């Protein structure tokens, strides 16, 4: 039901600090996403989109963020990019939907000690040392990990912003179903 304020949200977090939503206590009609001629991509893994109304889950969870359009390809299981490693990683056996649409009408982490777990998040802004030293403020070998996109109306559609919502699904009596 409340997708009207998840896909139609005034603004969105950006990818280092994405976060979820619940569809509990609902009945869901996913056609408001089937019949949406404005979605740039609609990539579901492990479940057929047009029969999602057939199914029943306990909860649905939607992660919301904003990526450069050329990295939409890496919100997907088993990808390799900076966004997939330090900001938002999808599981190998992931099942769910990645929806991306144009937002031309926001920061991202690019330095971290190791890769993220699937569905894990890193919110800290602490100076980065390439080999593990506590970095004294703006000295040497010191870099803050987070970093902005700096989107403008006038340049490449790949370099334009894109809003991305990732739906994942689910025991007990299922609480959200289709009509």
């Amino acid at each position, epitope marked *: 039901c409340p997708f009207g304020e998840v896909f139609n949200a005034t603004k969105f977090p950006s990818v280092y600090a994405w976060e979820r939503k619940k569809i509990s206590n609902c009945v869901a009609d996913y056609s408001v996403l089937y019949n949406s001629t404005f979605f740039s991509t609609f990539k579901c*893994y492990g*479940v*057929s*989109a*047009t029969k999602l109304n057939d199914l029943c889950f306990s909860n649905v969870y939607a992660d919301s963020f904003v990526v450069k359009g050329d990295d939409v390809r890496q919100i997907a299981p088993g990808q390799t990019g900076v966004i997939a490693d330090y900001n938002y990683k999808l599981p190998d056996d992931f099942m769910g939907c990645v929806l991306a649409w144009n937002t031309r009408n926001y920061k991202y982490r690019y330095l971290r000690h190791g890769k993220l777990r699937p569905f894990e998040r890193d919110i800290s802004n602490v100076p980065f040392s390439p080999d593990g030293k506590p970095c004294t403020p703006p000295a040497l070998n010191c870099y803050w990990p987070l970093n902005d996109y700096g989107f403008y109306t006038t340049t490449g559609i790949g370099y334009q912003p894109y809003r991305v919502v990732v739906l994942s*699904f689910e025991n007990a009596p299922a609480t959200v179903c289709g009509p």
Partner: antibody
Amino acid sequence: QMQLVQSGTEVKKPGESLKISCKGSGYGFITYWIGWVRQMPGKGLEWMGIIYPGDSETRYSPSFQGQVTISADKSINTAYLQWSSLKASDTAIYYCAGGSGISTPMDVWGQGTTVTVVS
Amino acid sequence: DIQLTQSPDSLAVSLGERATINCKSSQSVLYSSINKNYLAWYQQKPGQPPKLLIYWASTRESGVPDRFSGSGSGTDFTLTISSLQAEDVAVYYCQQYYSTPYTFGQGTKVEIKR
């Protein structure tokens, strides 16, 4: 619901190029992945590969990698199967089928394209 | 990777009896979380494109009559046509959509004894 219509019958000589098309039409198209299946006369079904027209991510079967190229264009909702040069072994019917996601069954089928290559 | 083999090659059944077709995979096709096997059954009548009958090994596509039934798990699955009718003369294939590359079974032709 959405339908799939492929290009007409093709009769070619051994050694020319060929690009067969598969156009989808109907509500909810952007969720569909288009796969290609070869049926030689009297034989079973052989999965060739799959493509998602949204970003043209394509996965090939090991038996068809490099032998044919699967293409797409989201301008006109059309997938493509291409040989740069046909072999007599490539005479068959070719179906394009559609799954509402990846790792899903194939909900929608095309009426088939007959491809004959002969001297 | 995942290779499917169905049995038998052909089977002839009287009208009204039951036609059963086995499908055997070389590796499980169950996604443990949702607990559904990623296996479909397709029917192909002469001169026509295949038609999806069953997915998730036991769920019927919309429009498929109730006499078609899927069952099985792990590595072994069966398709059963109850109340066998004349228009059910066709070749039936199983298919796994667990991993790419997808794989079909070699097919089973169902004939009628009348």
